[PDB]
Design an enzyme around this catalytic site. Structure first.
Site, PDB file in Angstrom:
ATOM      1  N   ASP A  29       0.875  -1.130   0.000  1.00 28.68           N
ATOM      2  CA  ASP A  29       0.000   0.000   0.000  1.00 28.68           C
ATOM      3  C   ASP A  29       0.943   1.218   0.000  1.00 28.68           C
ATOM      4  OD1 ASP A  29      -2.252   1.698   0.122  1.00 28.68           O
ATOM      5  OD2 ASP A  29      -3.134   0.609   1.798  1.00 28.68           O
TER       6      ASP A  29
HETATM    7  O1  LIG Z   1      -5.091   2.530   1.150  1.00 30.47           O
HETATM    8  C1  LIG Z   1      -5.439   3.258   0.187  1.00 30.47           C
HETATM    9  C2  LIG Z   1      -5.789   2.676  -1.186  1.00 30.47           C
HETATM   10  O2  LIG Z   1      -6.466   1.411  -1.051  1.00 30.47           O
HETATM   11  C3  LIG Z   1      -4.648   2.332  -2.132  1.00 30.47           C
HETATM   12  O3  LIG Z   1      -5.138   2.006  -3.412  1.00 30.47           O
HETATM   13  C4  LIG Z   1      -3.474   3.297  -2.272  1.00 30.47           C
HETATM   14  O4  LIG Z   1      -3.340   3.863  -0.956  1.00 30.47           O
HETATM   15  C5  LIG Z   1      -3.403   4.213  -3.510  1.00 30.47           C
HETATM   16  O5  LIG Z   1      -4.243   5.353  -3.450  1.00 30.47           O
END
Ligand SMILES: O=C[C@H](O)[C@@H](O)[C@H](O)CO
Ligand SMILES: CC(=O)O[C@@]12CO[C@@H]1C[C@H](O)[C@@]1(C)C(=O)[C@H](O)C3=C(C)[C@@H](OC(=O)[C@H](O)[C@@H](NC(=O)c4ccccc4)c4ccccc4)C[C@@](O)([C@@H](OC(=O)c4ccccc4)[C@H]21)C3(C)C
Ligand SMILES: CC(=O)O[C@@]12CO[C@@H]1C[C@H](O)[C@@]1(C)C(=O)[C@H](O)C3=C(C)[C@@H](OC(=O)[C@H](O)[C@@H](NC(=O)c4ccccc4)c4ccccc4)C[C@@](O)([C@@H](OC(=O)c4ccccc4)[C@H]21)C3(C)C
Ligand SMILES: *[C@@H]1O[C@H](CO)[C@@H](O[C@@H]2O[C@H](CO)[C@@H](O)[C@H](O)[C@H]2NC(C)=O)[C@H](O)[C@H]1NC(C)=O
Ligand SMILES: *[C@@H]1O[C@H](CO)[C@@H](O[C@@H]2O[C@H](CO)[C@@H](O)[C@H](O)[C@H]2NC(C)=O)[C@H](O)[C@H]1NC(C)=O
Ligand SMILES: *[C@@H]1O[C@H](CO)[C@@H](O[C@@H]2O[C@H](CO)[C@@H](O)[C@H](O)[C@H]2NC(C)=O)[C@H](O)[C@H]1NC(C)=O
Ligand SMILES: *[C@@H]1O[C@H](CO)[C@@H](O[C@@H]2O[C@H](CO)[C@@H](O)[C@H](O)[C@H]2NC(C)=O)[C@H](O)[C@H]1NC(C)=O
Ligand SMILES: *[C@@H]1O[C@H](CO)[C@@H](O[C@@H]2O[C@H](CO)[C@@H](O)[C@H](O)[C@H]2NC(C)=O)[C@H](O)[C@H]1NC(C)=O
Ligand SMILES: CC(=O)N[C@H]1[C@H](O[C@@H]2[C@H](O)[C@@H](O)O[C@H](CO)[C@H]2O)O[C@H](CO)[C@@H](O)[C@@H]1O
Ligand SMILES: CC(=O)N[C@@H]1[C@@H](O)[C@H](O)[C@@H](CO)O[C@H]1O
Ligand SMILES: CC(=O)N[C@@H]1[C@@H](O)[C@H](O)[C@@H](CO)O[C@H]1O
Ligand SMILES: CC(=O)N[C@@H]1[C@@H](O)[C@H](O)[C@@H](CO)O[C@H]1O
Ligand SMILES: *[C@@H]1O[C@H](CO)[C@@H](O)[C@H](O)[C@H]1NC(C)=O
Ligand SMILES: *[C@@H]1O[C@H](CO)[C@@H](O)[C@H](O)[C@H]1NC(C)=O
Ligand SMILES: *[C@@H]1O[C@H](CO)[C@@H](O)[C@H](O)[C@H]1NC(C)=O
Ligand SMILES: O=C[C@H](O)[C@@H](O)[C@H](O)CO
Lengths: 757, 756
Positions: free
Chosen positions: B253
């Site tokens: 993430d």
């Molecule tokens: O946790 C947040 C979202 O699920 C992830 O896709 C990224 O953070 C990119 O924005």
């Protein structure tokens, strides 16, 4: 309690008999209840009070595990230890059936036998280990089953003993109050402190088999368990025995095992023994006391009716009402405790002597042989040791429990041990007699020195003058032990150490034969090359010589194997095997868990002089073609009674004792003579802290000729591959790889394979 | 303790794995570090090119309702909203539509779907709305179909977030900006999860996503047993890559990576966003990984396996033979990225109709004392800013729907806040759709959409309007967003005061709720002036037109709740959101498997509305429960396979084999045609087991009055299994299994027993 008493219902085989016991017990008054449930005076080891109004007679409870004790006109059978060394299920059964015939014919209602796993064998020094069989749950279990079935198949109810974890004599401290001194005021009994896993996997195993056979009764032991007297331990009796094993029969106290009135009555005891017998010196906690406790409302009457139903179920099952045993005629308590004359009856049947001899021949165990056996036709034979000949005072000179001769008496051939598990002998067939018979057929000369070699003037010089020209020298050694004391160490009895030292000094062809209740120390001589052979003959009963000599001369090849481990030192065994203390509340923490006897030795990587299941033949056997037949399963149909042992795989129509697969191997006689062979199967069950290997089968192939092969078969039950889950309260088959091993001893296992569930 | 298993392409990716392996065998070390870490670009994340071998940069793009931050797309309803349909056809169609838009906008890898993290340990989770059901089985099914829908379009999926990511509070992503570092303030929340809870609850839906063929998985921000998820060797190398046999990549993430070497050894494959977002979210690989490989502290073969996993999806989806068109929008935003945007319209005929159909199929009727369906009311009143537009425009709240002022009248809540929101080409407001219908009936309709507590005269307006209305509609919302949990169940904005007013001046109040989650309506739910209550979740762009046909009875409501609506926050799993300033904050998952309805059922708590509850304009009668033990079948159709150990494995067997089927009959026993969601629960025997566990659902469409239909529930081996912590495998326990079939988790009129 956490642990209430379930009512008997007669279970599987005893349903009609239970129905009859219940009708009868329903008619009994309170005083009649207390009469049957406690001992009275009489000729037998114990005797229950009659219910004279309802035509229920006194029952005779009689020692012991080699056949009725303190009677004439009977046979002296080999000890449990001896029959175990046969590894022959046919003889275990036949022994018990033959005993059973003699108990019945002498008028016994309840035999105080067999010993079915108490003591099992946590110490090799236990002075009564010999009454039992194998130092192994599985094999003890099998022998227990057959011993119970042979007895019950004759007219006789059984009292399987001793429940439970009764593993040392020292401080067993039975309750007695005699001449103003009470055990209560000196020391409480040894407390066996046993974990739940050890209790299910080790100590309860053989009892479970004894129930399944089904024993009519169980004797509770002298020890406490977790600081509670076995005879009033609710967890032990009410839950483990009457609930998990589903025992439908009676709990009988050991003689002085009962220490209180009320706890024993609420916590599982059914019969107080010996009650008024033995002068009431062992406690007399029920009887009139129990009437007064019921009537003043502090012990439930219905609880006591259940006790009576359990005693009577045996009576009706065995048909003692419609075929009563004959009058018991011998005074077995002895004067001046009981002044009563004895009659006489002879119950020895044709066949029995030949059976006792056969057990002897089938058990003698050959431990070393450098080439001197079998004998051919030696012309000049020497024999050493008072063990070769008679007790100088008569075979029965040591009295009613074979324990009253002087500490230095020359007791002759050790045919049985001391205590309530002995029996009288009509005669002893001595090793010297049987050797001489053979010497005479060969036109040979034979001479024996049977004096005490330390203390008889001239004995040492007689030995020194005799031995040099002998072709062979037999040395007979022994080691008596008895109930009530443990052996202090592994030392030979009498002058045996001396006799061995003199023998190897003067002869280069010493054959050593040991009659013994247990392991002995032979470290000083066992590797001496003057000792060309060593055999252990255990406790052969009355046919001592005539069972040994055919083996020595090669008429039959030895086929017995050790039923316990023979370590080099007492220090190699389970630590704290015998606790000695002057503490009021002595403690034995079974911290080894399941690791006793060979499992201890295998876990600690200790090499015994002779391992569990070791024994030589005059030929050799080759193992081949290990097969695990996963398709050879079968429902457990055949048991007399069922346990209620929980297990993970249970459904409606299922058993812990179902055969789940069968394993086969082949053996080939690979030497130069015919021989029998005991094949053994061991399984390594996966899990943490598991024994390296646990016996789970044996099969004895008889008289396999030279070059021939034969298939051995080992049915494997669900229980045999199971573990007790302390967290769930149940038996389960663990997941993982199990190693299946087959061979001729616990360390001679050429064949192996893997089984997964 | 847990070594990293090499990819092999498994079941359907075999030929792509081979191509991948070949390309990666040619890569230099700098090329390896290029592809395995984020670079600057227009999309949420961008992998570096391997330009010598002709591998382009890949565009990773948010989010779980469609490409975020683009124009020319549609706004789909959220996960929560499709879950309330209970309709597998719509779960698949929605994903396939999002996919088409993802592909057509240029996306290689969609940061979607949400497949069990958050699952639903707290009803306050600010981002719970992105997922589906508070239930492993149903989330499982929805996850499978969403992956399948996205992959059947040209797009690689990044199923997220692995794992046990159950609160936003203290999620504490890695960030170091203007000299203050999260590392110096607070570590992430540590989810401490026992082994049976992890297998039975959290991994369930991820296993389904794996089987569906997800190309990648995103590791979460939380720690698990005090180890970061993106460097948790038990989590990634053992649980995911061994037991689940996952052949694809693990993507961090954004800020989920906290270190260089533990991450490379413990199962991370892609560092994101790398150089993106000013390198503020850490940049632990890249040229640092190159240096780690060259000096020998990180194995080069290890890294080649990262790169293989990334390329497998490229080759499997045929992105080399049919490359996406260029991505043309700045979705990061100035000043972080100064780059102009182009324009592409990707909205296809039929998408608006699909979005409407999901709304119509999801809206869930909670209460109706006889006011619905409407006939032809002549005087209609409408209250609440939720009824109309955001006064600053549908997209005023920015690229993540989260930048408007705390007091802004944001209008109809069509999606929540955060990385899983998306822009809208328009909003069909409830007021516009109500007006259109009013005008057909020759009626009058007036709406009070201002803030009733703060705008001069609103209270007096409401007081003058409502007494003469035939029906008053009250539109309520509750906005939530990524990065925060809700403090409580209270309604957003002026909603409480709106309700106090409505029931004072009208005795026919119909309440429509647009929401990210459960809200507190205790003060009014039992007032007889409130004649109906509906929950419409997050309906996307077609909010008004999906709702009005249901209200007027053109189609009956058929949605049912995807989670439990308890009377108070105190009735849920305790410690759902841990609040501390401790440096190492802890969340002990002591409840075990007992979340949402399992908690309520085990503690004897009656919710106001149970899991799987929803009314219709008709009633259904259930009968003739059949357990067909002969109807079994081999698992053939998964895209990929797991390696989950189970006691009954032989050579040619599966944990997903259908072992039996159950059937039941439903009869429309009212006065109107209606659809019904039938549900199946199973009580698995053993120690500390839930009372009941959903193990199937089937929705019968538009059953006419007096007609009957058979509902069918295939039961897999996994569906009657327990995880043995002692043996480390799935097993079907012995005992009695109760099988129950009904209209909700507490309305189960059929039951029978199965013993094995
Ligand atoms: O946790 C947040 C979202 O699920 C992830 O896709 C990224 O953070 C990119 O924005
Ligand atoms: C203590 C004991 O075990 O007694 C019993 C009688 O029921 C018990 C069961 C036991 O199996 C039985 C029958 C035996 O067969 C034993 O082999 C047996 C014994 C072990 C032996 O018992 C002992 O040696 C005791 O340690 C010995 N104990 C003590 O002296 C002692 C006294 C007070 C406090 C603590 C200890 C004892 C000797 C003699 C009479 C009574 C007790 C007595 C006993 O005579 C034999 O005892 C009697 O015949 C007897 C007992 C009490 C009164 C009168 C006779 C013995 C024999 C046959 C020798
Ligand atoms: C912290 C964070 O999540 O940033 C990211 C960028 O990758 C992350 C993934 C996330 O999905 C994304 C794209 C989002 O879409 C989020 O919805 C999102 C956020 C959660 C938001 O982040 C926050 O509000 C943080 O709690 C907030 N955190 C802090 O201020 C903070 C600073 C030092 C130590 C600890 C915390 C923050 C605000 C503004 C810039 C960076 C961080 C930033 C962000 O601008 C968006 O952030 C940026 O666009 C951005 C980040 C760093 C530098 C410049 C721009 C956000 C939006 C779009 C509003
Ligand atoms: C309780 O037990 C005693 C002992 O068995 C019974 O007394 C015996 O009764 C038999 C008849 O069955 C007589 O032949 C014996 O003489 C009695 N023995 C003694 C020592 O008295 C007694 O009857 C039983 N009591 C009850 C109430 O049944
Ligand atoms: C002969 O047998 C007697 C018993 O009948 C043995 O004497 C007992 O020996 C034990 C040792 O095991 C002592 O604890 C006892 O005190 C002895 N009993 C008596 C009454 O003295 C005797 O040891 C045996 N003889 C040999 C040589 O072993
Ligand atoms: C590492 O990746 C970068 C960023 O993708 C590559 O640089 C780009 O190369 C492409 C062609 O693949 C050009 O059109 C762009 O002009 C480049 N962008 C930037 C910002 O430099 C770089 O080539 C890659 N490195 C390796 C070794 O392949
Ligand atoms: C988190 O910690 C728990 C608690 O130790 C771990 O659960 C153990 O898992 C092993 C298998 O890896 C089992 O043999 C133990 O019995 C489990 N204990 C309990 C209480 O469940 C769990 O694996 C850890 N999870 C992670 C991702 O590391
Ligand atoms: C309208 O949407 C905005 C976001 O675009 C909401 O404002 C946020 O509300 C949360 C509480 O839920 C705060 O923690 C944030 O700080 C707010 N954001 C900003 C940028 O101030 C707003 O609450 C919504 N309006 C209503 C009435 O719900
Ligand atoms: C199947 C199961 O649920 N087992 C228990 C588990 O505890 C484990 C297990 O007993 C075994 O492998 O030993 C370890 C180490 O002592 C033990 O932790 O997990 C739960 C805890 O949530 C137990 O209470 C279970 O009964
Ligand atoms: C044997 C005997 O006398 N038992 C009595 C019992 O009857 C009562 C109780 C006091 O109520 O005291 C017990 O000792
Ligand atoms: C980014 C980087 O260079 N990491 C270095 C590695 O190259 C070497 C090692 C010491 O040998 O020290 C690491 O920190
Ligand atoms: C395989 C595994 O993942 N973990 C352990 C392992 O140490 C043990 O050997 C096995 C028994 O099969 O079960 C678990 O307790
Ligand atoms: C063996 O016996 C002979 C006498 O036959 C003797 O000379 C020799 O010392 C003995 N050896 C041992 C080891 O005792
Ligand atoms: C974008 O432009 C602004 C000037 O408006 C500048 O401050 C900023 O540094 C630029 N951003 C980047 C990443 O260069
Ligand atoms: C219901 O509505 C009427 C106005 O129609 C009002 O008088 C009454 O007090 C309201 N009742 C409740 C219970 O709020
Ligand atoms: O424990 C000793 C014996 O096993 C038992 O049978 C009694 O004591 C009677 O002699």
């Amino acid at each position: 309690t956490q642990w209430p008493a379930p009512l008997a219902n007669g279970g599987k085989s005893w349903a009609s008999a239970f129905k009859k016991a219940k009708a009868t017990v329903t008619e009994m008054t309170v005083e009649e209840l207390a009469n049957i449930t406690s001992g009275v005076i009489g000729l037998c080891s114990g005797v229950t009070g009659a219910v004279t109004r309802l035509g229920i007679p006194e029952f005779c409870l009689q020692d012991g595990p080699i056949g009725p004790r303190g009677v004439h006109g009977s046979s002296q059978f080999p000890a449990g230890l001896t029959v175990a060394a046969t590894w022959d299920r046919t003889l275990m059964y036949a022994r018990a059936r033959g005993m059973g015939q003699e108990f019945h014919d002498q008028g016994v209602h309840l035999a105080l036998a067999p010993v079915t796993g108490g003591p099992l064998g946590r110490t090799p020094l236990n002075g009564r280990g010999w009454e039992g069989t194998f130092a192994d749950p599985y094999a003890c279990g099998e022998a227990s089953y057959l011993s119970v079935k042979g007895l019950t198949d004759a007219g006789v109810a059984t009292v399987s003993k001793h429940w439970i974890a009764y593993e040392q004599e020292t401080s067993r401290n039975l309750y007695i109050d005699i001449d103003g001194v009470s055990q209560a005021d000196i020391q409480l009994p040894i407390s066996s402190n046993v974990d739940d896993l050890t209790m299910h996997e080790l100590y309860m195993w053989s009892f479970a088999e004894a129930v399944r056979a089904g024993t009519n009764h169980i004797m509770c032991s002298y020890n406490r368990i977790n600081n509670t007297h076995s005879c009033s331990n609710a967890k032990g009796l009410n839950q483990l025995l009457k609930t998990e094993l589903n025992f439908q029969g009676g709990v009988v106290s050991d003689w002085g095992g009962q220490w209180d009135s009320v706890p024993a009555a609420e916590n599982g005891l059914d019969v107080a023994m010996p009650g008024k017998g033995f002068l009431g010196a062992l406690g007399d906690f029920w009887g009139a006391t129990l009437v007064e406790l019921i009537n003043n409302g502090t012990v439930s009457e219905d609880l006591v009716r259940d006790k009576a139903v359990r005693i009577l179920t045996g009576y009706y099952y065995l048909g003692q009402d419609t075929n009563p045993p004959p009058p018991f005629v011998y005074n077995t308590i002895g004067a001046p405790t009981l002044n009563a004359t004895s009659g006489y009856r002879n119950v020895r049947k044709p066949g029995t002597a030949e059976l006792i001899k056969e057990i002897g021949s089938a058990s003698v165990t050959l431990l070393k042989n450098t080439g001197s056996l079998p004998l051919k036709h030696p012309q000049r034979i020497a024999v050493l040791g008072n063990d070769a000949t008679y007790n100088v005072l008569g075979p029965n000179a040591c009295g009613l429990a074979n324990s009253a001769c002087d500490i230095d008496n020359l007791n002759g051939t050790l045919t049985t041990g001391g205590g309530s598990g002995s029996a009288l002998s009509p005669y002893t067939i001595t090793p010297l007699e049987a050797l001489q018979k053979r010497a005479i057929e060969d036109n040979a000369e034979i001479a024996a020195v049977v004096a005490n070699s330390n203390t008889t003037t001239g004995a040492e010089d007689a030995i020194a003058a005799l031995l040099p020209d002998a072709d062979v020298t037999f040395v007979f050694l022994n080691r008596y032990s008895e109930e009530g004391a443990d052996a202090p160490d592994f030392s030979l009895g009498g002058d045996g150490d001396n006799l061995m030292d003199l023998a190897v000094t003067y002869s280069s062809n010493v054959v050593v034969v040991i009659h013994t209740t247990g392991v002995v120390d032979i470290e000083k001589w066992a590797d001496n090359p003057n000792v060309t052979a060593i055999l252990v003959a255990y406790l052969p009963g009355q046919e001592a010589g005539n069972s040994l000599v055919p083996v020595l001369y090669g008429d039959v090849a030895p086929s017995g194997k050790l039923p316990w481990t023979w370590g080099k030192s007492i220090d190699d065994y389970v630590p704290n095997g015998v606790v000695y203390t002057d503490a009021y509340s002595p403690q034995s923490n079974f911290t080894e868990g399941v690791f006793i006897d060979y499992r201890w030795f295998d876990k600690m990587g200790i090499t015994p002089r002779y391992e569990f299941g070791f024994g030589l033949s005059y030929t050799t056997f080759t193992y081949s073609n290990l097969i695990v037949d996963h398709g050879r399963w079968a429902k457990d149909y055949s048991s007399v009674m069922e346990t209620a042992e929980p297990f993970a795989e249970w459904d409606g129509t299922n058993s812990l004792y179902d055969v789940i697969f069968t394993v086969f191997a082949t053996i080939t006689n690979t030497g130069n003579l015919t021989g029998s062979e005991v094949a053994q199967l061991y399984i390594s069950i996966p899990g943490d802290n598991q024994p390296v290997r646990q016996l789970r089968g044996f099969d004895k192939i008889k008289d396999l000729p030279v070059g021939d092969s034969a298939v051995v078969t080992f049915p494997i039950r669900r229980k045999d591959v199971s573990s007790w889950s302390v967290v769930d309260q149940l038996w389960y088959v663990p997941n993982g790889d199990f190693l299946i091993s087959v061979g001729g001893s616990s360390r001679d296992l050429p064949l192996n394979t893997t089984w997964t569930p």
